[PDB]
JSON list of C-alpha atoms (C1' of nucleotides) in Angstrom, two decimals:
[
{"chain": "A", "resi": 1, "resn": "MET", "atom": "CA", "xyz": [87.59, 4.88, -73.14]},
{"chain": "A", "resi": 2, "resn": "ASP", "atom": "CA", "xyz": [87.14, 6.92, -69.95]},
{"chain": "A", "resi": 3, "resn": "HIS", "atom": "CA", "xyz": [83.35, 6.56, -69.71]},
{"chain": "A", "resi": 4, "resn": "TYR", "atom": "CA", "xyz": [83.27, 3.80, -67.10]},
{"chain": "A", "resi": 5, "resn": "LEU", "atom": "CA", "xyz": [81.01, 3.99, -64.04]},
{"chain": "A", "resi": 6, "resn": "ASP", "atom": "CA", "xyz": [80.81, 1.98, -60.83]},
{"chain": "A", "resi": 7, "resn": "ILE", "atom": "CA", "xyz": [77.75, 1.84, -58.60]},
{"chain": "A", "resi": 8, "resn": "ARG", "atom": "CA", "xyz": [78.06, 1.65, -54.82]},
{"chain": "A", "resi": 9, "resn": "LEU", "atom": "CA", "xyz": [77.45, -1.47, -52.74]},
{"chain": "A", "resi": 10, "resn": "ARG", "atom": "CA", "xyz": [73.65, -1.77, -52.78]},
{"chain": "A", "resi": 11, "resn": "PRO", "atom": "CA", "xyz": [71.76, -5.07, -52.34]},
{"chain": "A", "resi": 12, "resn": "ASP", "atom": "CA", "xyz": [69.97, -6.09, -55.52]},
{"chain": "A", "resi": 13, "resn": "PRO", "atom": "CA", "xyz": [66.76, -8.22, -55.35]},
{"chain": "A", "resi": 14, "resn": "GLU", "atom": "CA", "xyz": [67.18, -9.47, -58.93]},
{"chain": "A", "resi": 15, "resn": "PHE", "atom": "CA", "xyz": [70.57, -11.27, -58.96]},
{"chain": "A", "resi": 16, "resn": "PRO", "atom": "CA", "xyz": [71.29, -14.19, -56.60]},
{"chain": "A", "resi": 17, "resn": "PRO", "atom": "CA", "xyz": [75.02, -14.65, -55.79]},
{"chain": "A", "resi": 18, "resn": "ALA", "atom": "CA", "xyz": [74.69, -18.45, -55.71]},
{"chain": "A", "resi": 19, "resn": "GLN", "atom": "CA", "xyz": [75.69, -20.23, -58.93]},
{"chain": "A", "resi": 20, "resn": "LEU", "atom": "CA", "xyz": [75.76, -17.74, -61.84]},
{"chain": "A", "resi": 21, "resn": "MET", "atom": "CA", "xyz": [77.75, -14.69, -60.67]},
{"chain": "A", "resi": 22, "resn": "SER", "atom": "CA", "xyz": [81.01, -15.97, -62.20]},
{"chain": "A", "resi": 23, "resn": "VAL", "atom": "CA", "xyz": [79.39, -17.69, -65.22]},
{"chain": "A", "resi": 24, "resn": "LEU", "atom": "CA", "xyz": [77.10, -15.20, -67.01]},
{"chain": "A", "resi": 25, "resn": "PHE", "atom": "CA", "xyz": [79.35, -12.20, -67.60]},
{"chain": "A", "resi": 26, "resn": "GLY", "atom": "CA", "xyz": [79.16, -11.86, -71.39]},
{"chain": "A", "resi": 27, "resn": "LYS", "atom": "CA", "xyz": [76.86, -14.72, -72.31]},
{"chain": "A", "resi": 28, "resn": "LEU", "atom": "CA", "xyz": [73.77, -12.69, -73.26]},
{"chain": "A", "resi": 29, "resn": "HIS", "atom": "CA", "xyz": [75.80, -10.76, -75.84]},
{"chain": "A", "resi": 30, "resn": "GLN", "atom": "CA", "xyz": [76.02, -11.94, -79.46]},
{"chain": "A", "resi": 31, "resn": "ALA", "atom": "CA", "xyz": [79.81, -12.45, -79.27]},
{"chain": "A", "resi": 32, "resn": "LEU", "atom": "CA", "xyz": [79.47, -16.22, -79.80]},
{"chain": "A", "resi": 33, "resn": "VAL", "atom": "CA", "xyz": [77.86, -15.88, -83.23]},
{"chain": "A", "resi": 34, "resn": "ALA", "atom": "CA", "xyz": [79.85, -12.71, -84.17]},
{"chain": "A", "resi": 35, "resn": "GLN", "atom": "CA", "xyz": [77.53, -11.19, -86.78]},
{"chain": "A", "resi": 36, "resn": "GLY", "atom": "CA", "xyz": [77.77, -7.55, -85.68]},
{"chain": "A", "resi": 37, "resn": "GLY", "atom": "CA", "xyz": [80.13, -6.14, -83.09]},
{"chain": "A", "resi": 38, "resn": "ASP", "atom": "CA", "xyz": [83.02, -8.21, -81.78]},
{"chain": "A", "resi": 39, "resn": "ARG", "atom": "CA", "xyz": [84.71, -5.97, -79.17]},
{"chain": "A", "resi": 40, "resn": "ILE", "atom": "CA", "xyz": [84.23, -7.04, -75.55]},
{"chain": "A", "resi": 41, "resn": "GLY", "atom": "CA", "xyz": [86.64, -6.95, -72.62]},
{"chain": "A", "resi": 42, "resn": "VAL", "atom": "CA", "xyz": [86.88, -9.43, -69.75]},
{"chain": "A", "resi": 43, "resn": "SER", "atom": "CA", "xyz": [88.73, -8.62, -66.52]},
{"chain": "A", "resi": 44, "resn": "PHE", "atom": "CA", "xyz": [89.03, -9.81, -62.92]},
{"chain": "A", "resi": 45, "resn": "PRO", "atom": "CA", "xyz": [90.66, -7.44, -60.38]},
{"chain": "A", "resi": 46, "resn": "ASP", "atom": "CA", "xyz": [89.84, -9.69, -57.46]},
{"chain": "A", "resi": 47, "resn": "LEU", "atom": "CA", "xyz": [92.31, -12.48, -56.69]},
{"chain": "A", "resi": 48, "resn": "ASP", "atom": "CA", "xyz": [91.52, -13.41, -53.07]},
{"chain": "A", "resi": 49, "resn": "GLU", "atom": "CA", "xyz": [92.11, -17.06, -52.10]},
{"chain": "A", "resi": 50, "resn": "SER", "atom": "CA", "xyz": [91.12, -17.41, -48.43]},
{"chain": "A", "resi": 51, "resn": "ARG", "atom": "CA", "xyz": [88.60, -20.27, -48.20]},
{"chain": "A", "resi": 52, "resn": "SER", "atom": "CA", "xyz": [86.46, -21.69, -51.04]},
{"chain": "A", "resi": 53, "resn": "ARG", "atom": "CA", "xyz": [86.04, -18.37, -52.87]},
{"chain": "A", "resi": 54, "resn": "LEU", "atom": "CA", "xyz": [87.71, -16.52, -55.74]},
{"chain": "A", "resi": 55, "resn": "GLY", "atom": "CA", "xyz": [85.99, -13.40, -57.05]},
{"chain": "A", "resi": 56, "resn": "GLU", "atom": "CA", "xyz": [82.62, -12.10, -55.91]},
{"chain": "A", "resi": 57, "resn": "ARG", "atom": "CA", "xyz": [82.06, -8.48, -57.06]},
{"chain": "A", "resi": 58, "resn": "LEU", "atom": "CA", "xyz": [81.73, -7.00, -60.56]},
{"chain": "A", "resi": 59, "resn": "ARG", "atom": "CA", "xyz": [84.40, -4.80, -62.15]},
{"chain": "A", "resi": 60, "resn": "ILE", "atom": "CA", "xyz": [84.95, -5.89, -65.77]},
{"chain": "A", "resi": 61, "resn": "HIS", "atom": "CA", "xyz": [86.17, -3.36, -68.33]},
{"chain": "A", "resi": 62, "resn": "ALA", "atom": "CA", "xyz": [84.80, -3.71, -71.86]},
{"chain": "A", "resi": 63, "resn": "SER", "atom": "CA", "xyz": [85.71, -1.84, -75.05]},
{"chain": "A", "resi": 64, "resn": "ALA", "atom": "CA", "xyz": [85.01, 1.63, -76.39]},
{"chain": "A", "resi": 65, "resn": "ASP", "atom": "CA", "xyz": [83.01, 0.86, -79.55]},
{"chain": "A", "resi": 66, "resn": "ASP", "atom": "CA", "xyz": [80.45, -1.47, -77.92]},
{"chain": "A", "resi": 67, "resn": "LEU", "atom": "CA", "xyz": [78.54, 1.11, -75.86]},
{"chain": "A", "resi": 68, "resn": "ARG", "atom": "CA", "xyz": [78.53, 3.69, -78.67]},
{"chain": "A", "resi": 69, "resn": "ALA", "atom": "CA", "xyz": [78.13, 1.93, -82.05]},
{"chain": "A", "resi": 70, "resn": "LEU", "atom": "CA", "xyz": [76.45, -1.38, -81.18]},
{"chain": "A", "resi": 71, "resn": "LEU", "atom": "CA", "xyz": [73.67, 0.27, -79.12]},
{"chain": "A", "resi": 72, "resn": "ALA", "atom": "CA", "xyz": [71.76, 1.86, -81.99]},
{"chain": "A", "resi": 73, "resn": "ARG", "atom": "CA", "xyz": [68.93, -0.59, -81.12]},
{"chain": "A", "resi": 74, "resn": "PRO", "atom": "CA", "xyz": [67.36, -0.52, -77.63]},
{"chain": "A", "resi": 75, "resn": "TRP", "atom": "CA", "xyz": [69.23, -3.18, -75.68]},
{"chain": "A", "resi": 76, "resn": "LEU", "atom": "CA", "xyz": [70.57, -1.47, -72.52]},
{"chain": "A", "resi": 77, "resn": "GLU", "atom": "CA", "xyz": [68.57, 1.79, -72.39]},
{"chain": "A", "resi": 78, "resn": "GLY", "atom": "CA", "xyz": [65.44, 2.80, -70.49]},
{"chain": "A", "resi": 79, "resn": "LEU", "atom": "CA", "xyz": [67.57, 3.81, -67.50]},
{"chain": "A", "resi": 80, "resn": "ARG", "atom": "CA", "xyz": [68.54, 7.18, -68.97]},
{"chain": "A", "resi": 81, "resn": "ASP", "atom": "CA", "xyz": [67.06, 9.92, -66.76]},
{"chain": "A", "resi": 82, "resn": "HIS", "atom": "CA", "xyz": [67.26, 8.13, -63.40]},
{"chain": "A", "resi": 83, "resn": "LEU", "atom": "CA", "xyz": [70.08, 10.10, -61.76]},
{"chain": "A", "resi": 84, "resn": "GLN", "atom": "CA", "xyz": [72.36, 13.00, -62.67]},
{"chain": "A", "resi": 85, "resn": "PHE", "atom": "CA", "xyz": [75.96, 12.13, -63.55]},
{"chain": "A", "resi": 86, "resn": "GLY", "atom": "CA", "xyz": [78.39, 13.58, -61.01]},
{"chain": "A", "resi": 87, "resn": "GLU", "atom": "CA", "xyz": [82.09, 14.32, -61.10]},
{"chain": "A", "resi": 88, "resn": "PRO", "atom": "CA", "xyz": [83.81, 12.18, -63.76]},
{"chain": "A", "resi": 89, "resn": "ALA", "atom": "CA", "xyz": [86.33, 9.44, -63.02]},
{"chain": "A", "resi": 90, "resn": "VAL", "atom": "CA", "xyz": [89.89, 9.31, -64.33]},
{"chain": "A", "resi": 91, "resn": "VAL", "atom": "CA", "xyz": [91.65, 6.48, -66.12]},
{"chain": "A", "resi": 92, "resn": "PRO", "atom": "CA", "xyz": [94.34, 5.26, -63.68]},
{"chain": "A", "resi": 93, "resn": "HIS", "atom": "CA", "xyz": [97.92, 6.09, -64.61]},
{"chain": "A", "resi": 94, "resn": "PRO", "atom": "CA", "xyz": [99.40, 3.23, -62.53]},
{"chain": "B", "resi": 1, "resn": "C", "atom": "C1'", "xyz": [103.57, -40.53, -0.72]},
{"chain": "B", "resi": 2, "resn": "U", "atom": "C1'", "xyz": [96.55, -43.06, -2.53]},
{"chain": "B", "resi": 3, "resn": "A", "atom": "C1'", "xyz": [92.37, -48.94, 3.75]},
{"chain": "B", "resi": 4, "resn": "A", "atom": "C1'", "xyz": [99.73, -47.69, 0.85]},
{"chain": "B", "resi": 5, "resn": "G", "atom": "C1'", "xyz": [103.12, -51.72, -0.60]},
{"chain": "B", "resi": 6, "resn": "A", "atom": "C1'", "xyz": [102.33, -58.51, -2.53]},
{"chain": "B", "resi": 7, "resn": "A", "atom": "C1'", "xyz": [99.62, -62.68, -5.03]},
{"chain": "B", "resi": 8, "resn": "A", "atom": "C1'", "xyz": [98.61, -69.04, -10.79]},
{"chain": "B", "resi": 9, "resn": "U", "atom": "C1'", "xyz": [92.06, -71.81, -8.63]},
{"chain": "B", "resi": 10, "resn": "U", "atom": "C1'", "xyz": [93.38, -76.53, -11.18]},
{"chain": "B", "resi": 11, "resn": "C", "atom": "C1'", "xyz": [92.85, -81.37, -13.22]},
{"chain": "B", "resi": 12, "resn": "A", "atom": "C1'", "xyz": [88.52, -85.21, -15.39]},
{"chain": "B", "resi": 13, "resn": "C", "atom": "C1'", "xyz": [83.29, -86.14, -17.11]},
{"chain": "B", "resi": 14, "resn": "G", "atom": "C1'", "xyz": [77.15, -89.72, -21.77]},
{"chain": "B", "resi": 15, "resn": "G", "atom": "C1'", "xyz": [71.33, -85.99, -19.10]},
{"chain": "B", "resi": 16, "resn": "C", "atom": "C1'", "xyz": [68.08, -89.68, -21.06]},
{"chain": "B", "resi": 17, "resn": "G", "atom": "C1'", "xyz": [64.00, -92.81, -22.20]},
{"chain": "B", "resi": 18, "resn": "G", "atom": "C1'", "xyz": [58.21, -91.77, -23.49]},
{"chain": "B", "resi": 19, "resn": "G", "atom": "C1'", "xyz": [53.96, -88.70, -24.76]},
{"chain": "B", "resi": 20, "resn": "C", "atom": "C1'", "xyz": [46.50, -86.75, -28.59]},
{"chain": "B", "resi": 21, "resn": "U", "atom": "C1'", "xyz": [46.00, -79.96, -25.59]},
{"chain": "B", "resi": 22, "resn": "U", "atom": "C1'", "xyz": [40.86, -80.03, -27.08]},
{"chain": "B", "resi": 23, "resn": "G", "atom": "C1'", "xyz": [35.61, -78.59, -28.18]},
{"chain": "B", "resi": 24, "resn": "A", "atom": "C1'", "xyz": [32.26, -73.80, -29.12]},
{"chain": "B", "resi": 25, "resn": "U", "atom": "C1'", "xyz": [31.63, -68.26, -30.71]},
{"chain": "B", "resi": 26, "resn": "G", "atom": "C1'", "xyz": [28.14, -61.76, -34.80]},
{"chain": "B", "resi": 27, "resn": "U", "atom": "C1'", "xyz": [33.21, -56.49, -33.24]},
{"chain": "B", "resi": 28, "resn": "C", "atom": "C1'", "xyz": [29.60, -52.54, -34.60]},
{"chain": "B", "resi": 29, "resn": "C", "atom": "C1'", "xyz": [27.72, -47.65, -35.48]},
{"chain": "B", "resi": 30, "resn": "G", "atom": "C1'", "xyz": [28.72, -42.39, -36.49]},
{"chain": "B", "resi": 31, "resn": "C", "atom": "C1'", "xyz": [32.29, -38.75, -38.74]},
{"chain": "B", "resi": 32, "resn": "G", "atom": "C1'", "xyz": [34.68, -32.08, -43.37]},
{"chain": "B", "resi": 33, "resn": "U", "atom": "C1'", "xyz": [41.67, -32.61, -42.18]},
{"chain": "B", "resi": 34, "resn": "C", "atom": "C1'", "xyz": [42.33, -27.50, -43.84]},
{"chain": "B", "resi": 35, "resn": "U", "atom": "C1'", "xyz": [45.00, -22.78, -45.55]},
{"chain": "B", "resi": 36, "resn": "A", "atom": "C1'", "xyz": [49.95, -20.86, -48.04]},
{"chain": "B", "resi": 37, "resn": "C", "atom": "C1'", "xyz": [54.74, -21.41, -50.78]},
{"chain": "B", "resi": 38, "resn": "C", "atom": "C1'", "xyz": [60.77, -19.35, -56.45]},
{"chain": "B", "resi": 39, "resn": "U", "atom": "C1'", "xyz": [64.86, -25.47, -54.71]},
{"chain": "B", "resi": 40, "resn": "G", "atom": "C1'", "xyz": [67.09, -17.98, -59.18]},
{"chain": "B", "resi": 41, "resn": "G", "atom": "C1'", "xyz": [72.33, -22.28, -52.72]},
{"chain": "B", "resi": 42, "resn": "U", "atom": "C1'", "xyz": [77.23, -25.93, -54.63]},
{"chain": "B", "resi": 43, "resn": "U", "atom": "C1'", "xyz": [71.05, -32.33, -55.97]},
{"chain": "B", "resi": 44, "resn": "C", "atom": "C1'", "xyz": [76.84, -39.78, -60.09]},
{"chain": "B", "resi": 45, "resn": "A", "atom": "C1'", "xyz": [81.48, -38.70, -64.81]},
{"chain": "B", "resi": 46, "resn": "C", "atom": "C1'", "xyz": [74.67, -40.75, -71.86]},
{"chain": "B", "resi": 47, "resn": "U", "atom": "C1'", "xyz": [78.40, -43.97, -78.62]},
{"chain": "B", "resi": 48, "resn": "G", "atom": "C1'", "xyz": [80.89, -37.92, -83.75]},
{"chain": "B", "resi": 49, "resn": "C", "atom": "C1'", "xyz": [85.89, -31.24, -79.98]},
{"chain": "B", "resi": 50, "resn": "C", "atom": "C1'", "xyz": [94.64, -33.73, -83.71]},
{"chain": "B", "resi": 51, "resn": "G", "atom": "C1'", "xyz": [99.59, -36.29, -77.56]},
{"chain": "B", "resi": 52, "resn": "U", "atom": "C1'", "xyz": [100.52, -36.13, -68.31]},
{"chain": "B", "resi": 53, "resn": "A", "atom": "C1'", "xyz": [105.46, -32.33, -69.26]},
{"chain": "B", "resi": 54, "resn": "U", "atom": "C1'", "xyz": [102.56, -26.18, -68.14]},
{"chain": "B", "resi": 55, "resn": "A", "atom": "C1'", "xyz": [102.41, -26.07, -75.66]},
{"chain": "B", "resi": 56, "resn": "G", "atom": "C1'", "xyz": [98.15, -25.76, -80.24]},
{"chain": "B", "resi": 57, "resn": "G", "atom": "C1'", "xyz": [91.39, -23.58, -85.77]},
{"chain": "B", "resi": 58, "resn": "C", "atom": "C1'", "xyz": [85.21, -24.05, -79.21]},
{"chain": "B", "resi": 59, "resn": "A", "atom": "C1'", "xyz": [78.66, -19.74, -86.08]},
{"chain": "B", "resi": 60, "resn": "G", "atom": "C1'", "xyz": [77.47, -25.54, -78.25]}
]
RNA sequence: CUAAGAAAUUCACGGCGGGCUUGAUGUCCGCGUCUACCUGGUUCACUGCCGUAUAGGCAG
């Protein structure tokens, strides 16, 4: 649905951009056994072929049921009351 | 416009016969190498996934 958020360009000391930033995008999910939910979306906005690089930042739109129905068990929570949600984003008409 | 501008060294050939280098010797004696660290950077193609032509069932 609409409820997609992007964070701004902050350096993260937990994720090295060396060998796994274009490999592990949906690998920790259970979509390879497919016992529960099966909806996941994979996208790549960034097609830039200059020199020895294709794709380096994260913007990958998943489904609508996965954040709402599959997350009845704690798997992505804990980071609830960190910041206040601001003005909402629109779904792009072009 | 250059101490400018020029240029054939060439032919031939037996180095070779012989030989005792020896004898002797104490290297010793002492010694604290230490402290720390993500190879989470691209560090050979190991027998059981239906056909280069853009075409086909990956509970790895």
